[PDB]
Nucleic acid binder design. Structure first.
Length: 941
RNA sequence: GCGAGCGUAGUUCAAUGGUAAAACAUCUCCUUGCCAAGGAGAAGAUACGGGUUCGAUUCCCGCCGCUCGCC
């Protein structure tokens, strides 16, 4: 009932049962059956998030005292085929509610869009009551929540988890599927959807029991997606054959003054402020001067809910000067006794100057009749009315919404404040008429004010608390955090990829210190800081003497905050996330690390080639040779192989399934603790480097072998088994995987062979690899090397004349392409590029049959006896792997006997048989540079 | 999967509302001949389709290819 034109304001309460989250009722947060509260509003009323905050203080919360935050989180579900954009609501660190605008459902777009608010009533009641474990929540006066739902939590888990008969469910799945597919032919949507409901249930208690393998999930999701995809198209029609019984949705001259334009919004993401406070100022800078208007210091600003721009002392009229303008040539328009044909009139009509006010000028060919024009001063406030809406509509985001019309933006626009001097610039955009009002800090005494003159805008804004200048929020975060961190004895850890995302989550910052327990310090350091940074957005604190962690953290509130309830509320969320990660860790140190391999066989890699255990199986059997292609020392080929079986073992651990960014850290941590060598453990970490664009590369010796051998397999397998990247679409990430393999080499001084390693790591795969499909992987790698090499300030014509035969070993190519440009800029390049061109053109094909023929059989020539000597004494130096400088000094002395041979000897055949000496003697001199550079492409030939 | 930027002789690049320029390559004519080099001349392009305007390579829409970020 969100599909159609039908208005549907409704709100209900329902439990929700998901069995794979059943944990016998012991961990205080996860339940197999939890109550929700759902409210859907269609159409969107407009107050849709000022009714929410009345709801909160209705259920007894003090919203001027706690810290309510709208942190963005999109929503998508492919099974139903729906998605939407919106936020989640953090009260004092706890995520309590989701808030979404819908845009797809089934597979047909929505009109009008719906608003979905979904409270979760057991994560709210533990916070509002000071309780850590759900079985202490007071249900009513006298009875507890545990004493009602505990054994249902306890023994429905044993059913969904161990004793669920798993074939009388595999049959019921297909039975329900068939019945729902049949009742979609008598045109009955209601039961034909209830059967989809009770089939997608029976799939969950299959998945929980583990009976679903790894390759059946892609089939089950498909089987059940096209049932919801085609119940929708039946419902939306059976509605309209009734006639929609619930209505239908249809719809002056003076000195210069400043000019300020703000576009209020609802909370934008943290990185849609940065890429939208630029393509607005640029798009304004252009159009201010395109229309002949002069100004001064233009300056942008940003906040999660406004995007302001200020242009100072803007003009009051256009510049109003007369400019020349030339039109069509005298050939097209002008003619003898036929001057106005069809073009002269079109050239004067759009300019309305009289037709006898034209003259001629030597415009190249003394043509292009023309005249003058006027600029038409237009008061600088009726100009902007025409050009602002196309400014504001210009900004473009990757993800975008619709709320009440077909206009698209990233979040709904709520107010527009655009003024100039004292007067308002009047226009309208997306149903909002511009004015001079603005909302300050929400839920304050200045939640609505009006600014009179545009020169006291900023001074009024920061009179309501807001700090809009983005670069003066960083300096009030990182400078009131230091006093706190030094009051306890330490200092903060602020990677500037976290400050750029803490700045744009706040409007008027306020920092607070908090304490967590000391007995959590036994965890690894890089799980503490990852909990405190990548999920909660806190600041850790490290004692600057003996620089390890302390039991403190720093959090950033927003506004007029009680700062006695928010510290106490934040201290008790990462007393729970730590308390879960500690249980996971203690469950992971129960077994030696070498046993976590045999769980790997339940992670999919690719369908027709398999899991991850087989892939890591196909690497121990080849990492004993890629250490010979790289020329690794002999006394380390043992110490690599035992660190190759343990590789990628931590990917089945309990932690790494929860914190999927610690793949690689929590393998070295276990390995060192188990009692391996140091270099084994350190190599167990760089099988993952680099993880993205711009990360450290493997430096140790056994760290390169594995990081190369993995990237060879994930290339040859994915290529020779269907998934080729031939598209703009990038599945399986075949671009960065191929890009990193050349950086691990050019950054590490290694000599490799791309056409021998790919003839040996393809031999192993399960599917057959023919010699033709590895000749495209070499090209897909060489193009990536060329792109890496061009954008280092290199010239484009030399990197295509070294990559013809030095393209195999990616280090020597990147070595000899930088060393060739510096030689190309010196004044010996035109001597050599010609010296080698006189004997490669002259031999464009004359049936040289006797292959070698270089002999003194009959060499009765004069200059031959002095040319072949030079060829031998240079060819004795140039070996197939020499550098470019020995070449560039060994050909300069060969260039002279060339012009002493061509001067006299008549190479072409005046005799019948003996004219092949004179041909081979130049074929050889032409072929010497085969292996160093392909000299027949460079210009100047 | 979505966005962003691009497409001009054979290769590299200037221009813009209305006679699309130059470099290297190609061709012909020269002759201390066949190669090279110095000289004159000639031919050669806006990926494709649609829209307004008198005229679009330029402004608008749609299709094809390429490069790059996220998934």
């Amino acid at each position: 009932r969100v599909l159609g034109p039908e208005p549907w304001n409704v709100a209900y309460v329902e439990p929700s049962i998901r069995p794979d989250d059943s944990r016998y009722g012991d961990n205080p947060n996860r339940l197999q059956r939890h109550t929700q509260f759902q409210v859907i509003l269609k159409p969107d009323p407009g107050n849709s998030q000022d009714l929410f905050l009345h709801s909160l203080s209705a259920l007894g919360i003090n919203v001027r005292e706690h810290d309510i935050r709208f942190v963005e989180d999109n929503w998508e579900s492919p099974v139903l085929g729906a998605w939407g954009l919106g936020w989640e609501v953090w009260m004092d660190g706890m995520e309590i509610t989701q808030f979404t605008y819908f845009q797809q459902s089934g597979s047909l777009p929505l009109l009008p869009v719906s608003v979905e608010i979904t409270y979760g009533l057991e994560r709210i009641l533990m916070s509002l009551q000071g309780v850590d474990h759900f079985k202490n929540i007071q249900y009513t006066k006298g009875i507890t929540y545990g004493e009602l739902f505990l054994e249902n939590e306890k023994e429905m888990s044993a059913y969904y988890l161990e004793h669920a008969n798993v074939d009388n469910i595999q049959k019921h799945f297909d039975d329900f599927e068939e019945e729902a597919r049949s009742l979609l032919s008598l045109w009955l949507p209601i039961p034909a959807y209830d059967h989809v409901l009770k089939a997608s249930h029976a799939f969950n208690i299959l998945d929980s029991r583990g009976f679903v393998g790894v390759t059946e999930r892609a089939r089950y999701f498909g089987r059940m997606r096209s049932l919801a995809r085609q119940c929708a198209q039946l419902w939306v029609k059976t509605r309209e054959n009734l006639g929609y019984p619930l209505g239908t949705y249809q719809e002056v001259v003076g000195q210069p003054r400043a000019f300020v334009l703000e576009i209020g919004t609802e909370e934008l993401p943290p990185h849609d402020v940065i890429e939208a406070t630029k393509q607005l100022e640029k798009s304004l800078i252009q159009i201010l001067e395109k229309r002949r208007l002069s100004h001064g210091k233009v300056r942008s600003y940003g906040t999660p809910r406004r995007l302001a721009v200020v242009v100072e002392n803007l003009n009051m009229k256009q510049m109003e000067e007369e400019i020349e303008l030339r039109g069509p040539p005298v050939a097209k328009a002008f003619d003898q006794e036929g001057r106005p044909t069809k073009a002269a009139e079109g050239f004067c009509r759009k300019n309305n100057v009289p037709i006898d006010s034209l003259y001629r000028r030597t415009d190249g060919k003394t043509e292009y009749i023309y005249a003058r024009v006027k600029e038409s001063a237009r008061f600088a406030d009726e100009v902007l009315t025409e050009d602002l809406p196309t400014i504001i509509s210009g900004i473009s985001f990757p993800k975008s919404m619709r709320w009440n019309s077909n206009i698209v933006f990233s979040r709904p626009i709520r107010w527009i404040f655009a003024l100039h001097g004292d007067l308002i610039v009047p226009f309208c955009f997306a149903g909002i008429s511009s004015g001079n009002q603005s909302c300050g800090l929400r839920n304050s005494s200045l939640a609505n004010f009006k600014v009179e003159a545009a020169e006291l805008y900023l001074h009024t804004l920061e009179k309501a608390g807001i700090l809009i200048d983005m670069q003066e929020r960083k300096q009030r975060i990182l400078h009131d955090s230091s006093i706190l961190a030094e009051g306890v004895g330490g200092d903060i850890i602020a990677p500037d990829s976290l400050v750029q995302e803490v700045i744009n989550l706040v409007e008027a910052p306020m920092p607070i210190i908090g304490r967590y327990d000391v007995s959590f310090l036994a965890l690894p350091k890089d799980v503490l800081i990852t909990v405190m940074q990548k999920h909660q957005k806190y600041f850790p604190v490290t004692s600057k003497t003996m620089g390890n962690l302390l039991p403190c953290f720093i959090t950033v509130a927003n506004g007029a905050i009680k700062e006695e309830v928010v510290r106490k509320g934040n201290e008790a969320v990462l007393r729970a996330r730590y308390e879960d990660a500690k249980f996971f860790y203690k469950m992971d140190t129960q077994k030696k690390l070498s046993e976590f391999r045999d769980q790997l066989s339940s992670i999919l890699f690719h369908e027709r080639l398999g899991t991850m255990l087989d892939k890591m199986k196909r690497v121990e059997n080849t990492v004993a040779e890629v250490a010979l292609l790289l020329g690794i020392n002999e006394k380390m080929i043992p110490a690599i192989k035992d660190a190759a079986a343990l590789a990628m073992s931590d990917l089945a651990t309990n932690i790494v399934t929860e914190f999927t960014s610690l793949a690689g850290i929590m393998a070295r941590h276990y390995a060192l603790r188990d009692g391996l060598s140091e270099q084994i453990a350190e190599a167990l970490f760089e099988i993952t480097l680099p993880r993205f664009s711009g990360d450290v590369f493997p430096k140790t010796d056994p760290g390169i072998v594995l990081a190369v051998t993995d990237r060879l397999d994930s290339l040859v397998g994915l290529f020779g088994a269907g998934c080729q990247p031939s598209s703009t679409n990038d599945p399986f990430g075949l671009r960065r995987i191929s890009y990193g393999l050349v950086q691990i080499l050019v950054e590490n001084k290694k000599n490799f062979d791309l056409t021998k390693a790919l003839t040996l790591v393809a031999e192993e795969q399960p599917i057959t690899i023919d010699s033709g499909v590895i000749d495209e992987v070499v090209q897909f790698v060489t193009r990536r090397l060329e792109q890496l090499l061009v954008d280092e300030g290199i010239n484009c014509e030399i990197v295509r004349s070294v990559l013809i035969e030095r393209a195999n070993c990616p280090y020597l190519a990147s070595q000899t392409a930088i060393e060739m440009e510096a030689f190309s800029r010196t004044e010996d390049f035109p001597k050599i590029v010609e010296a080698y061109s006189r004997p490669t053109r002259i031999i464009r094909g004359k049936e040289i049959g006797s292959a070698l023929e270089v002999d003194a059989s009959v060499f009765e020539k004069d200059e031959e006896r002095a040319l072949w000597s030079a060829y031998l004494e240079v060819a004795d130096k140039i070996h197939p792997g020499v550098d470019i400088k020995a070449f560039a000094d060994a050909s300069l002395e060969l260039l002279q006997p060339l012009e002493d041979f061509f001067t006299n000897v008549f190479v072409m055949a005046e005799d019948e048989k003996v004219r092949n000496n004179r041909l081979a003697l130049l074929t050889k001199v032409a072929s010497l540079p085969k292996g160093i550079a392909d000299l027949s492409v460079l210009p100047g030939f």
